[PDB]
Design a protein around this ligand. Structure first.
Ligand SMILES: *[C@@H]1O[C@H](CO)[C@@H](O)[C@H](O)[C@H]1NC(C)=O
Ligand SMILES: *[C@@H]1O[C@H](CO)[C@@H](O)[C@H](O)[C@H]1NC(C)=O
Ligand SMILES: *[C@@H]1O[C@H](CO)[C@@H](O)[C@H](O)[C@H]1NC(C)=O
Ligand SMILES: *[C@@H]1O[C@H](CO)[C@@H](O)[C@H](O)[C@H]1NC(C)=O
Ligand SMILES: [Mg+2]
Ligand SMILES: [Mg+2]
Ligand SMILES: [Sr+2]
Ligand SMILES: [Sr+2]
Ligand SMILES: [Zn+2]
Ligand SMILES: [Zn+2]
Ligand SMILES: [Zn+2]
Ligand SMILES: [Zn+2]
Lengths: 479, 479
């Protein structure tokens, strides 16, 4: 469709004149950040952002690519180089070390320098690097971790944990030799390394002894407790703090978030990762936006400010499945959470960064018409005389050969929430990609986010803006 | 390989502290741009930039991803939305209208508003939109167009031409009805629409009457003149100007560039597009870097300044072939030209923008080790038990089935300059992609390049910075 208003050059000339006017108005702050928020889109590379924009624009009443996402409205953009020390295409653990601790690490470790080695417990000590969340707490700020994954998963764990193996969710995962050597599982690290005021996401099962029924799935034994050491970590965490509450459903979360006198809140809403938004039970489970608002209600009470980590964690999981429908709907909900947090905080005293840990081998091609569905077929047949999709993957589990041939695909098939887009190379899981990702920033000192930077810059600019960490003696006026 | 220096957190902490220091030093100019340069990487999306960085870093003595490209050193970055009015995944003609004329257009038209229609000559008049190069000339600046494509190809044509069909290179291409209606071929438009001081690239054949032997290939008749109208456009162009020279080889180009008294220079170095850098004859053909320096020698003589368009034009062509080796080597030469132009001009009075018209369905995945070749195999076998490459395409001519199966690939095969990376979907040509591309900027008013913008912003910020176009009464001090 060609929109009539866009046929007149004046439309474009007016828009551009307005954009120049807005660019000229922007001015750097001389003041510090009271609050810090990092919004982490796991796997949300540039192709994901664009495809999500088109989908979100269409879900409103529009053609798609012209309608800004909430993240698109952030004034300052940089590119971030995501390589881990040992691998050009990174994982979530070692990238977390970069954007939360300010130091690059080795693939599949978390919160360690690259002197440590994956799955070698005896290389841990001496190599711990402390997160800016930890530093914010040390400075008297409240701190919160919100995600749609397990709260023990690689991204959130970067805020609090130090481990040579991101797979060590509970003691059941840690080999006996490493347990003997004192390497703590991530669930233990979650309650023990530092005080965290708000913890919201998945991961019930790692907190409870083997045999403990899950409250939501008391008749599915695989969803029960995993721990070998007999410990109830939720009860241990509650015991250590006045005003602490544990919740496992939406209604109780929202109740707790309105109760002054709560002060510490742990909400764990599934045994493992949270459901995809498209599968979410709206009576029992909070959306990402709802978890972020609940967190902000509590964190905002502290006059010294807060650090919050919010993760669109299952964007990544959608791409790994080669189900763009799931990756993109998770992206929209992530952008809705960014929008909500911007309503509940002030850019006068809150530095907000949106970024991704790494990208995916996800592409958006063919030559589709303006207004067409992102989940549709490319115009024209391929050289094998069958249809193909505008969305494709380099590799992953969408690769199919039926009767020794690439399958044809229809619009009804391609638009299904279970549809897997085709790839070049069959793998059980599609792979991350190595290309630079975007950083969007707004608020005090956001103008420092510029150019092409190492991913470690994210942690450092946040520490600097809030006068933490090695940047006490920032030269900044108070928020 | 894990580089020893990177195992120490101090390495990363020092780098980040230096990056913060550099970010704090940057300050907006109050002065105008005397000169404007736009460097256009045709097809050079984010995945291309990253993969090129790694290749260029390795060609030096290094591991790859840590070594900045010249473009990476530009202080200001924005994302650019590339959609054409009628198509989400754009072509080079209509994107050119956006980044050179400041107005979006319809797929496969050039220099027209979206009121015009592809291949409908009778929708042209009234819909012409004037480029910022044209406006720079009107203001007394010298202007130049440098590319590795035909100088009549879609990108360079955006600087000077208005046409409903980018395929109308010479009169031989224009249907009789359109010739009768007065639609001029692009080669004619090149010499007739506006005065251009420097024209360097390919496209000899469109300038000369059918039967005219090419000077380099006088024994290949397909490389000869195409024109039906009997015209020699080179001679017409020379006749219209004192101090004009035409050259068709490297030695004569460089001679002409050192001769004051030349003033106007047209250098056309192949019948069609220039050779890929890897095939270039270094005695007969100038590199992109050499063409840009030759242009700058002439353009810099004007005290009022200049506008220069430089295009890494065959980055795109490499991707279309699904031969990443060609796409990436063209990218490196493009970055070398950017580096050279920065040596020959001052960021005190020259606004330089590097961008792309659109991206490609090119991805960089698997989990390769630090320091490994970008053209190598991903570690580990695929689910069909054969090897695969770290570089892949969504679609294009790398798709193969030998004996009804995906072919295995070796390192020696995958590293060859003729190697085509595999894709999901066979097409004769790999497709463009729709995702946002980067804009890098340095110089006067470069701080206005920020955030996520429409691709039209590129033309508008350039016009504004130089006080042209609708922005006479910019509010700026002189350069
Ligand atoms: C870690 O443990 C293994 C024992 O199997 C040993 O080979 C290696 O030397 C140890 N490294 C250190 C730093 O002690
Ligand atoms: C939510 O949890 C509370 C506390 O255990 C429980 O009493 C309530 O029934 C739960 N809601 C649902 C629908 O299960
Ligand atoms: C362009 O030409 C064709 C004649 O084949 C006609 O159908 C169409 O109406 C014309 N459009 C205009 C604007 O004259
Ligand atoms: C370059 O062109 C000039 C001018 O026609 C010609 O005299 C010279 O021989 C050319 N060089 C080569 C190597 O062909
Ligand atoms: Mg994650
Ligand atoms: Mg081009
Ligand atoms: Sr639940
Ligand atoms: Sr030649
Ligand atoms: Zn990730
Ligand atoms: Zn992942
Ligand atoms: Zn192009
Ligand atoms: Zn192209």
């Amino acid at each position: 469709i060609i929109p009539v208003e866009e046929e007149n050059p004046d439309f474009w000339n007016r828009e551009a004149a307005e954009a120049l006017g807005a660019a000229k108005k922007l001015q750097p702050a001389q003041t510090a950040a009271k609050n810090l928020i990092i919004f982490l889109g796991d796997g949300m590379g540039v192709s994901t952002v664009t495809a999500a924009r088109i989908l979100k624009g269409q879900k409103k009443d529009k053609l798609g690519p012209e309608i800004p996402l909430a993240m698109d409205r952030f004034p300052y953009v940089a590119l971030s180089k995501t390589y881990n020390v040992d691998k050009h295409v990174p994982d979530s653990g070692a990238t977390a070390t970069a954007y939360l601790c300010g130091v690059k690490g080795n693939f599949q470790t978390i919160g360690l320098s690259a002197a440590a080695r994956f799955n070698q417990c005896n290389t841990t000590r001496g190599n711990e690097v402390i997160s800016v969340m930890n530093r914010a707490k040390k400075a008297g700020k409240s701190v919160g971790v919100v995600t749609t994954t397990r709260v023990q998963h690689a991204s959130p764990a970067g805020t609090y944990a130090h481990t040579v193996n991101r797979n060590w969710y509970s003691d059941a995962d840690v080999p006996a030799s490493a347990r003997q050597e004192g390497c703590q599982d991530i669930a233990t690290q979650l309650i023990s390394n530092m005080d965290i005021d708000v913890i919201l996401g998945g991961g019930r099962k790692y907190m409870f002894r083997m045999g403990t029924p899950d409250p939501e799935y008391p008749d599915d034994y695989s969803q029960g407790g995993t721990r070998l050491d007999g410990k109830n970590l939720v009860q241990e965490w509650l015991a250590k703090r006045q005003g602490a509450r544990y919740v496992w459903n939406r209604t109780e979360l929202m109740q707790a978030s309105l109760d002054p006198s709560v002060t510490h809140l742990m909400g764990l809403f599934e045994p493992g990762d949270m459901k995809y938004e498209i599968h979410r039970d709206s009576t029992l489970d909070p959306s990402l936006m709802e978890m972020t608002e609940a967190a902000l209600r509590l964190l905002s009470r502290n006059p010294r400010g807060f650090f919050l980590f919010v993760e669109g964690g299952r964007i990544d999981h959608g791409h790994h499945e080669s189900r763009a429908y799931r990756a993109l709907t998770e992206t929209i909900m992530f952008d809705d959470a960014i929008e909500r947090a911007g309503q509940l905080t002030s850019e006068e005293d809150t530095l907000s960064l949106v970024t991704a840990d790494h990208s995916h081998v996800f592409s958006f091609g063919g030559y589709p018409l303006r207004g067409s569905s992102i989940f549709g077929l490319a115009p024209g047949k391929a050289r094998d005389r069958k249809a193909y999709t505008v969305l494709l993957y380099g590799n992953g589990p969408g690769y199919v050969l039926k009767d020794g041939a690439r399958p044809d695909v229809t619009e009804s098939e391609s638009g299904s929430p279970e549809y897997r887009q085709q790839s070049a190379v069959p793998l059980d899981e599609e792979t991350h990609a190595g290309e630079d990702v975007a950083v969007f920033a707004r608020g005090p000192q956001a103008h420092l986010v510029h150019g092409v930077q190492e991913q470690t810059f994210i942690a450092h600019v946040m520490a600097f803006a809030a006068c933490l960490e090695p940047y006490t003696a920032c030269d900044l006026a108070p928020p």
